[PDB]
Amino acid sequence: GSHMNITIGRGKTARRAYGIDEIALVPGVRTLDPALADTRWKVGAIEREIPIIASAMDGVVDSRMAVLLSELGALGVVNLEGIQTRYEDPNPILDRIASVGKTEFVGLMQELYAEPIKPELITKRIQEIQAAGGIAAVSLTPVGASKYASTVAEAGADLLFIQATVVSTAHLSPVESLDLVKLCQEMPMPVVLGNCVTYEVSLELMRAGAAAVLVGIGPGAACTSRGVLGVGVPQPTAIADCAAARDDYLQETGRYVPVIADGGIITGGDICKCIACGADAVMIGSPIARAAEAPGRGFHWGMATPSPVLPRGTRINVGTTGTIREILVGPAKLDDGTHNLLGAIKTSMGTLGAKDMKEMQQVDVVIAPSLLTEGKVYQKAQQLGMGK
Amino acid sequence: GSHMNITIGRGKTARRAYGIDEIALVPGVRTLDPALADTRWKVGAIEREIPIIASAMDGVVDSRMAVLLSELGALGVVNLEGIQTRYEDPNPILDRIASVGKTEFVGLMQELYAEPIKPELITKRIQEIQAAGGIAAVSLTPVGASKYASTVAEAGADLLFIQATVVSTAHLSPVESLDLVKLCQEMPMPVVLGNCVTYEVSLELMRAGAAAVLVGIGPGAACTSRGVLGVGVPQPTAIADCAAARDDYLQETGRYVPVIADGGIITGGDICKCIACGADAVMIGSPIARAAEAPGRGFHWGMATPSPVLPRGTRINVGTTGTIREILVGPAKLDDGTHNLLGAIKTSMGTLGAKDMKEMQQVDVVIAPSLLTEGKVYQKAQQLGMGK
Amino acid sequence: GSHMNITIGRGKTARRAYGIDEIALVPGVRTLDPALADTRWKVGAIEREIPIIASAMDGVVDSRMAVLLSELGALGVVNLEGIQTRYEDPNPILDRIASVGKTEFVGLMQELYAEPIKPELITKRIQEIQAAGGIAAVSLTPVGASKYASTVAEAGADLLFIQATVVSTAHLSPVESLDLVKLCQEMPMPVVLGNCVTYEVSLELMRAGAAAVLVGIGPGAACTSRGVLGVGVPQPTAIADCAAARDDYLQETGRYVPVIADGGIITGGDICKCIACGADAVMIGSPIARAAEAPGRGFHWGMATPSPVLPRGTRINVGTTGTIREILVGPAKLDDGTHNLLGAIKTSMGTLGAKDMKEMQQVDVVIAPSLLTEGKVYQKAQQLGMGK
Amino acid sequence: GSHMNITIGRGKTARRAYGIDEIALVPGVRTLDPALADTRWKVGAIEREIPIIASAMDGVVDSRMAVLLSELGALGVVNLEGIQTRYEDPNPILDRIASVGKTEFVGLMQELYAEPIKPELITKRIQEIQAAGGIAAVSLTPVGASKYASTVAEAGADLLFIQATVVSTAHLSPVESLDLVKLCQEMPMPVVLGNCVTYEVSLELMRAGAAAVLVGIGPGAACTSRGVLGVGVPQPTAIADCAAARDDYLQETGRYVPVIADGGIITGGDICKCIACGADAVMIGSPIARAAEAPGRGFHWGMATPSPVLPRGTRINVGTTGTIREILVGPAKLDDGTHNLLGAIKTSMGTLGAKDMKEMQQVDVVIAPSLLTEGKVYQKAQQLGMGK
Ligand SMILES: O=c1[nH]c(=O)c2[nH+]cn([C@@H]3O[C@H](COP(=O)(O)O)[C@@H](O)[C@H]3O)c2[nH]1
Ligand SMILES: O=c1[nH]c(=O)c2[nH+]cn([C@@H]3O[C@H](COP(=O)(O)O)[C@@H](O)[C@H]3O)c2[nH]1
Ligand SMILES: O=c1[nH]c(=O)c2[nH+]cn([C@@H]3O[C@H](COP(=O)(O)O)[C@@H](O)[C@H]3O)c2[nH]1
């Protein structure tokens, strides 16, 4: 049920939800120098200068990437159910994924990801990241946590991400469902929970003890769950609803639970739109898969692509456009806002007069589908700038 | 008339109708394991585990396909006014339809479908399906029913579908119009009636004795009636209006008349959206014409294409992507949700917390045109996943 | 001003107008056999079985086409300011226009159309059409009428069309403006006036003595006025507003002034949508330029293309798909509703239960942008049916 | 905050903003001869017959273009932070920009635009334009004005444009922010200020002493700021809001500050739409870069493309379609409304009955996305007229 009830037909209503591509940000009463724009966020006791997290996807984050992201002031999450924990040396496996043709990568991944997880590799990945001075953030599905959460705790990871395509505090197992309250209470580190798109679920995740909530179902560049299942709420609406839960939970308890907008982001402008709708940080995959150091070798695939029965992701060719440093902090060599993402955030905040991220969440927004079309006929035809 | 009156101009109003591509499904309060999702539906006394019916189209269903579908838990309808009853061996005819060029198939079909129906073949198709252990479901137009309904009864078909592009209980013949009340009373088997898109007509079809109602005018992949006639209501709105008639008819009489969303479905997500708007089952053609066993040999054409005066269908090349087994129950080798349709339904129901089809009809819906665009720039450009 | 005031910005409002491609027709309470559908309309004392008028465009109507259309039960208008009155032999000129390349036709037409009008040819075209048994309908611009209206009267044309891109009863000349009241009173034949898109103007044209009003600014397939000037109201809204003026004028005076929806029509479905919004007949150009007998030799150009200072039309390649008989009354060999237009109207009226054109004007309409997209992915990709 | 609050999600609202491509103009009560349409505007004491200003962009305006535009009754602005002030002979530089490939121009421009500004060239450009009989209009960014405003005054420029992507009267420097009140008071010539898109900012710019306000953030054909930053309000809404500020400032003080719609204009129709929403004149770049005399050699690039850290523009290929005379006053050789822009304005005003620009600002507007799609299937497919 909802307080908004557009009529689909007799006895069936809906509410309008707006996508990243439908909104735009409006200047306020003042501008400010981009150098003054404060972009920090915080999860648990970990402060970060860059409000960006690399998705737990095998084309995006390996141990080296996690360290490079940590040194730049950002974060990267290693997926503990991917190739990194199933193979001692993932590089030959990543080589095969990148070289196979378009009609074959699904069947290949279904085979390669069938190799059983080695619990010892969970520990090693955590420890080799930390030994190199990086923040060790790792992800598990709810089922994975029931099996490997204690391994993560004993290894001493800095952050645990429990991430399912759609998560709730209430799950009807066929089997004991994962008790998220117990998990957050028992794990020695902060626990991030996702994904959701509704006020109701995000609030319950916060009440369960979440250190942050991941918002987004299916917006990702390599994700097909929306086509396979028909499930999803566009990001601006999802982010705003979950930010409202954050603010109500803060009022109730005094505890601040950051909201992370997860997926569907290509440009710095996409990031800024997500912050304006309430996000404290963003989780992105495809923009970082384009880094020279990315394990995907120019490819980027969803972690549900290898499902043996029902793939819900695909493998796309994103290419390689620069170093992870250039992508995050520049200098930008490109015209499309996919490099120097931090500089884009600070520049946008400057034009809008937002001194820090909380002020950025307060900027006025317009519904403006023409933002991406007005005057862009040449760019679209010639695949330049906003038309690439 | 309608209770909603958007203004087109002075003295002309309209109501907004929403298409499959305009909506999305929102998670509820709980998730559940897909293995617990009950996907059954029932028409007459026939229960089916898969809520899918193959359209009565010559590229989709022949006798073998009808048996294969029944064995898997679904249904297939043989069109008794197509080539199956006009030719003892349809295979050479299907060969010609598939081999001729784009500028020639209309004229060819106008000729081939002029071969008179052989009443003995009506009996033969029904009985050869049943002798092989399949459920024999057959379709006729209203005019066809006035001539051949008794032949279908004498042959002992399990289900009769009366299907016109647009049907009503009230028809002004130039001829005696088909009395649908008498037909349903006199036929010894359940009679499905369609097609319609309004509460008013669907309710009258139920009062006439329909075992089910087919909803949809022109959404089909090989249909051109919307361009030829300008008639149609997008599916979510039509389904909801007709589901409302079902619920009112149930309150009035205690009899449940399932609503079948007919046409325009490509992916598992499209199916789930139709159920969420009130459908008890779906009738699909093009997704099954892509089966290796489909008689269309990779082509799919509307059964109004052969009209000698005004074709209202076309012949499209849908290709061959897998076996009918793979398409309906998997395992899925593809990234786009066109295989393992049953698995997609159960997985979607799982993410939404819908234990059975009735609960699925209650899931919250958003108007979200961005569901199909957010983040999908690569998929569209490379024709992968949702961009194919 | 208007009673609908959507906000563009502070102090600037607007009203929503809907295009042909945004609406669809909804079945009513009954269906009827297409053979019973009465499609007649009437202008002056001239009854026509086919409610279609061929546009006064040099690629569409010459003397032969005007006769062929009259014989089939329709009408064709000869433009008295085009090639037909500037050259004794238009065929070599039409050959050149159709034979020159895309980058050259503007300059060529600017040259060719500078040849002065020969008033004697006005008489000749009218008289040769009538001598062949055809209805002689001719068009002039308002300025043209001030110079040649008496020639048309002396020649004895059956119908006079006064047509400007945008006409009003009130025009500020630099020159004596055309007195439309006097024109209609003095002309011995019915005078059709256009074009307009508003209730206010159409009502004044009616009060001035119009036998019919032409509705439409810029929807045409070979028209660019909307891009050059930014002026226009989409057809459904324009038709409905002008139909309301017709109904009010009828109440005031008892005189019925038919509303003609002019331009932007490709298929029979487009015609039916225009009738449903209030049109008594349609004026179409591009569908008839596709006739084997069309003077355009497969090309179709706007009559403002030859402007020596500011072209407001272009030349498109529409091809040649059949005889004018096939296009209007079939039998249709095509799958896209561009042939057997009369059969399409009658079939559509049948599905909607409309016994005559007045009933067709009462059919329910939905705002349904998805009408043209639902399920049409294959047709669009393969350029078949609705995707051509 | 705003008086319109569409809901994005709980606790986040927005207002609908409409783009140029979403609106259309409606005829009024009368038409008038285009020769009677008064298109004049005025800034300071400078009256101009053509309400068009060439953008301060290096592909659009050099000294020759500025003179040619002035002679025709328009204006051209020289960007004093581009190559015209960094190189004594810009031609070899313009040659290089036009010769490099798509993947190379960003890096090249970052290098070429790093050449320091030569203050003596500021004087030279201004005075050589005036010596040739042209009106010398020049642009600076706010930071540039703090350094070179006195140089412009000493040189005796006719108009000074202070232009930033987003400007406000309130700017938080890291440094003394530019005092716009002092600037306008101390400069001996009129000072135009921009850019903005809100009533609040434009009103303050007027109160600071602006001779005109530039409206627009990111609509330009060679701009990517909307993608890089996510900031922008579509032009019709921005123009109307800022025109409302003009009218209130006029009521307050009796001083008229013209509103200039800046960017995103391709055709005469786009111009007319902007005037109808309140603009007193338009600033355009890409349509004038297509002139034979344009310094871009057929290319057109944003002046933020050369940013060494975060480019916010791109280089597009606009080609060369005619002389600047043909583009502005015709005769038009093209079918798409990109030539004879003045004739298009007067013709549009004629169809609408607008005797002067103030009446044009009062024309009725419809929200009509179908203006650019209705009937245009051929034009789009064949890239003719409105489909190029
Ligand atoms: O439906 C899905 N199937 C998948 O296979 C999949 N893999 C990743 N994700 C989610 O997408 C996010 C990455 O989005 P981008 O690539 O656009 O950053 C990630 O951060 C996840 O939230 C998936 N969603
Ligand atoms: O207007 C029409 N003209 C035709 O020739 C035609 N043939 C099939 N159908 C209908 O389309 C449904 C199949 O749609 P899909 O191929 O999208 O499943 C089918 O189940 C039918 O409802 C037609 N509709
Ligand atoms: O703006 C315009 N510039 C032109 O050059 C032009 N030529 C024809 N017309 C109008 O278009 C109608 C024909 O439209 P179709 O080809 O789509 O039928 C015709 O019936 C006219 O109303 C023009 N409109």
Ligand SMILES: O=c1[nH]c(=O)c2[nH+]cn([C@@H]3O[C@H](COP(=O)(O)O)[C@@H](O)[C@H]3O)c2[nH]1
């Ligand atoms: O965001 C931006 N980055 C740039 O690099 C840039 N360069 C020009 N402009 C603005 O665009 C206007 C020209 O627009 P058109 O080429 O569409 O006329 C100009 O008049 C400016 O207002 C820019 N905006």
